[PDB]
Structure formats: C-alpha cells, structure tokens
C-alpha cells in the first residue's frame, strides 16, 4: 500500500502480489490469534477430521456437530446431525454463537471488578 | 613444472644484451638489400652463431608465475588453466565475465 | 512435447512489384544467403515471361504455382510389428513453398546461359501443366490414395479416444493417443 516491491521486473513484484492474495484470503479472520484456542467449534467433520484429532492431543475441550457418516465417538459434547441441506447447517451455527458470546459480554465487566481487588 | 623452462628465462636476458645489442641491424646491414654492392662478406656474417640463443625466435617465454609449459598468453605471463584460477579470486585488474 | 503452439516470422512484399507470391519465392530462390542476386533473377525472369505474353508479367508465374502444387504429405506412425504410412494435409505456407522449390530445383540444372532465362522457361513449362513437377505432384497424391487403409498406432488408438472421455471419433488434440 506504501509502494515498495513493485520496482525492477514485473515478475519479482507479481510473485509477491499473488501470494499476498493467497494468504490474505486464507488467514483474514484468524490473523490476530496469539496462541492455541480455548475450545473447538465443529459444524461438519467430513474433510476436517484432523483438526479434531490434533485438538484432543493438545487437551482442548471439544464442541462437535457431526454428520451421518461421522462417528459420535471421542469428544466432550457432540450434537448428532447431518451434513446436507444448507438451511439446516445455518440454524446449528446461529444457536452456538449466542450461548458463548452473551455469557462473554457479561464476563468482561465482571473481570475488571475481580482484577481490581488485588491492586486495592 | 620443470626447472629447465625457468633456467632458460633467466639465461636469455644477459645474452640478449651481450650478443644481440651489437648485432641489432647487423643482419640487415651485412646480408639483406642494404648490402647492395656493399659488405656481402662471409667473414662479417659468420658472427650470427653467438646471438643464436639470444634470438627474437626464442622469446616464447611461457609462464613467469609457475614456469608451466604449453598454451601461453604474454598479456598475463600465464596459461588457460592458470589465468582462470587467478580470475576466479579477482587477482587480474580489469578482468570481468563477458556478456554482449 | 511443447506446451503451446508457436507461430513464425513473416516475409514482406518485394520492393519492385508489391507481391507476397514473389516475396515467398525469392526466399526459396536464396543461395548462400544472397537474396539480392535472387531478386535480380526473379525480376529478369518476369520480363522474359512478359515477352512470351505482354498481357501480364506475372501471368505464367502465378498459375505455375497453382498447377504444380502438392496438397498432401505422407507420415509414419507405428502399429505394433509394422510402421505403415498415413497421409496428412500440408499447410498453405508449405504447399506454396514445396511448389516454388520444385520449379527452381529444375530451373538451376536446365543449362540455359542465365538463371533468369532458365527459370522463366521452366515457368513456361509448368504453367501449361506439361513440365517436370507435374509427375512429382501426381506421385505424392498416388501415395495418399494408395495408403488410405492405415492410421496412427491403430489398434490401441481406436480404444483410447472413447476411453479418455474424448469423443467416438479421432481427436486431433494434445494428450489423446495419436
């Protein structure tokens, strides 16, 4: 955005522009993440089985929504579900976020008040 | 390597000066066209045996750095292999890769 | 091999007439790079033609290059224990250049005292379709009519088009077995 690598040949700038684009699309909504996350959110296991495997070895509590060919096995809470129908998977996702997030809104104000007793 | 090609290079310079200096134009003066009805006398051209080693015809030199035979270059005092070796480490002034 | 199709340099209408048919000709008339000699010969031929008929200087030149023309070439592409042959159609740029080459192959042994007379005279012959490359055009078509039986790796190739989710007819395109 400064204009900094676009000099010399078009090749040296473009092979960076195109890679910046591949990274930007892949990482844009996870970019600030400072460390291994506190829980794991599965809406479908069909290609992402590995994310569940690794999370369990790192000792993270697992929250799953598993499809019909997936197994219910080896996680901390499961919802048995199915992977088809774009109207179903949308409703499963709207529901999960509310319970964690407005519990969280209340938590943040509480935490300042908890922390302040120490410094008093 | 051989000591004989180094021994040669040292021997020629006192003998260039000793035989050759008096003899410089003497091939032209006593023998060639400048001897038109003048000189042409054997007894003053039997004297070119002495400059025989000190001759322009034996300034083939070969390397000064190593004394190494065959493939010589006067402009380095070197040969093919030995030029390239000094050039790799940047020892020769002005020498660069050629592109055009 | 070869990722995509590549084109070719282009020769440019001659400075004395403005003709592409001359400009392609002067090039197959070239001996030891010497195209400015092959120019004097081409244009001195055209004035000799104009003396047989003054109605066009390019008249017998242009029609010779229609009449002695090859359309076809023969290719080889193995079938098992035997190689056989398959005719293939030649591209216009090489159809023209084969036909001009053959007029000039004959003209340089014709023994007339100048290549300008020799060449003009071998255009008189091939213009009426009576000359030296009439047999050479016929022989090349005889091979294409005789060898219409065989195809390029014929036993496996007939399965391969229908099996590569290609069509039920011989695919002229990269990564089908041809």
């Amino acid at each position: 955005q400064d204009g900094t690598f676009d000099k010399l040949t078009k090749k040296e700038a473009l092979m960076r522009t195109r890679e910046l684009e591949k990274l930007e699309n892949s990482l844009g909504g996870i970019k600030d993440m400072g460390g291994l996350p506190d829980a794991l959110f599965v809406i479908d296991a069909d290609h992402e089985h590995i994310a569940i495997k690794e999370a369990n070895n790192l000792g993270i509590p697992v929250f799953a929504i598993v499809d019909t060919n997936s197994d219910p096995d080896g996680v901390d809470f499961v919802i048995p579900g199915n992977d088809d129908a774009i109207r179903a998977v949308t409703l499963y996702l709207g529901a999960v976020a509310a319970t964690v997030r407005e519990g969280r809104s209340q938590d943040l104000a509480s935490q300042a008040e908890e922390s302040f007793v120490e410094a008093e | 390597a051989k000591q004989s090609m180094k021994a040669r290079e040292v021997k020629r310079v006192a003998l260039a000066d000793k035989y050759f200096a008096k003899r410089a134009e003497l091939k032209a003066i006593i023998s060639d066209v400048n001897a038109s009805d003048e000189d042409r006398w054997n007894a003053v051209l039997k004297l070119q045996t002495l400059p025989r080693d000190s001759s322009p015809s034996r300034q083939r030199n070969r390397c000064r750095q190593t004394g190494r035979p065959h493939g010589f270059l006067r402009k380095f005092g070197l040969s093919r292999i030995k030029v390239r070796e000094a050039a790799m480490r940047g020892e020769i002034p002005g020498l660069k890769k050629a592109s055009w | 091999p070869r990722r995509r199709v590549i084109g070719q340099r282009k020769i440019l209408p001659d400075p004395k007439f403005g003709s592409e048919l001359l400009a392609k000709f002067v090039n197959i008339l070239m001996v030891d790079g010497k195209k400015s000699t092959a120019e004097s010969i081409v244009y001195s031929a055209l004035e000799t033609l104009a003396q047989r008929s003054g109605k066009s200087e390019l008249e017998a030149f242009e029609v010779a290059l229609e009449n002695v023309r090859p359309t076809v070439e023969v290719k080889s592409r193995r079938v098992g224990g035997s190689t056989y042959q398959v005719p293939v159609e030649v591209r216009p740029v090489r159809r023209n250049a084969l036909a001009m080459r053959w007029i000039v192959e004959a003209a340089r042994k014709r023994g007339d005292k100048s290549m300008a007379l020799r060449l003009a005279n071998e255009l008189s012959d091939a213009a009426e379709n009576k000359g030296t490359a009439v047999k050479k055009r016929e022989d090349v078509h005889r091979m294409a009519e005789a060898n219409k039986a065989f195809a390029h790796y014929r036993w496996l190739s007939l399965r391969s088009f229908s099996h590569q989710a290609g069509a039920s007819s011989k695919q002229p395109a990269l990564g089908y077995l041809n």
């Binding site: - | 750095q65 380095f76 005092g77 000094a86 940047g90 002034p93 660069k96 890769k97 | -």
Partner: protein, 232 residues
C-alpha cells in the same frame, strides 16, 4: 560438480577487484607477477596476525597495500614497528618502493576465511567430527548473517575413499551478480594429506560499495562547459 566460481563473475559490477593497477598492456604481466609475489611472500610475514583479505595497488613508482584484519591493532604492532617491517620487505620484493594502510574492520566473526580456518583446525587434529559441521553452521547463524553453506572435504576420519558432507541453511543465492557474498575455499593439511573447507556466508542482496556515477556529463564538473561552435 557444476557452476562457475561465484565471485569470478561479479568483478565487473558492484564488486571491486582483488588488485587495482594500470601498466599499459606490455608491462601488465611483470606487474601481475610482482603483485602475485608480494601477495605470496607477505601473508607468510604477518602469519602471527589474523587477516581476511589482501588488496594490492600499484600507482606510479609506488606500491600501495590495503590489508583487512580481525581487529585494528594486530598488524600495526608496537609503536608502528611491525607494519614498518611489512613495508620494508614489500619494497625489497617489489620493483618499486612501498606504502601500507590498514582498512576499516568489518564482520571479522562472520568472515568466510576465519570460519573455514576454524573448521580445518579440527581436521588437522583428528577429532571424531561427529557434530562439527552443524555446530559450524549453528554459531555462524547465531553471530549474524542470513544464510550459510558449508561443504567439507578431505577423506573424513582418514578414509581410503573421498567421503564428503555439506550443510546449507537460510538463503544462499549462487548465480548472483549484484552485492558481495563472501566465499572462501580453504586448503590446509593433516596426517593423511590435504583436507579443506568451503564457506559461503551471506550478508545482503544490496551493497552500494561500488555503483555507477549519479549524473550525466553536463551537470557534473564545470558550470561553463560550452564551446565556440567553430572558429578554427
């Protein structure tokens, strides 16, 4: 075993030469052979110091040595006497009387040749060499630079075969024509014959230490440059 030597191709652009003189063709060989003799016989005299490079220059009637060192004092010695004994014997060697300056000291812990001298020294003393090449790379990248390649030769452990090993890490470009990149091929001895270490170490892709001039002829030098336009 492919490739032209890496520093051999850079000497016309943005790297200066190992020697800088002019001798007008006919005397060019007698001057290179003297420049070679002063290089060969001088590095033996400063054996007791540490040195990374030598750059020899022949102005008129004078030979000027520039020398590159691990630290400013080492060649200088006690009351300037040590460097005055260098300049005395370069004058004896050379076909002219001699001058000497010490350069600025730069990256002595990272230099190609002071690392390759260190790795050969292990081989000279017949150590098992189990970790040596890796610990070379580790310490060289711990002290600086952006990539290192090490290649070790000499019939390792004393074998009756050739037996190599090598290790590259980070970035080491190979065909580069711009910036310095520091390479040294050491040759050194042990009990069974010659052993040797090759050290490519890499500081940067851009060095400005030689570049083409800023300006066209007209704005550089004299304000009044203009000619009469005839009047012979």
């Amino acid at each position: 075993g492919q490739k032209v030597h890496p520093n051999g191709i850079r000497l016309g652009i943005v790297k200066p030469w190992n020697s800088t003189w002019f001798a007008n063709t006919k005397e060019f060989a007698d001057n290179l052979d003297s420049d070679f003799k002063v290089r060969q016989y001088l590095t033996k005299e400063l054996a007791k110091a540490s040195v990374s490079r030598i750059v020899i220059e022949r102005p008129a009637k004078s030979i000027r040595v520039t020398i590159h060192t691990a630290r400013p004092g080492i060649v200088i010695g006690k009351k300037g006497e040590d460097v005055e004994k260098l300049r005395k014997v370069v004058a004896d060697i050379a076909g002219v009387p001699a001058q000497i300056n010490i350069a600025e000291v730069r990256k002595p812990e990272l230099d190609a040749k002071l690392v390759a001298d260190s790795i050969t020294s292990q081989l000279e003393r017949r150590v098992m060499f189990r970790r040596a090449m890796k610990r070379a790379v580790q310490n060289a990248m711990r002290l600086g630079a952006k990539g290192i390649k090490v290649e070790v030769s000499g019939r390792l452990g004393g074998a009756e075969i050739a037996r190599t090993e090598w290790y590259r890490e980070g970035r080491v470009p190979l065909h580069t024509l711009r910036a310095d990149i520091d390479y040294n091929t050491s040759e050194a001895h042990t009990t069974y014959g010659v052993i040797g270490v090759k050290v490519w170490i890499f500081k940067g892709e851009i060095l400005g230490g030689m570049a083409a001039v800023e300006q066209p002829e007209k704005p550089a030098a004299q304000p009044k440059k203009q000619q009469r336009k005839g009047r012979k």
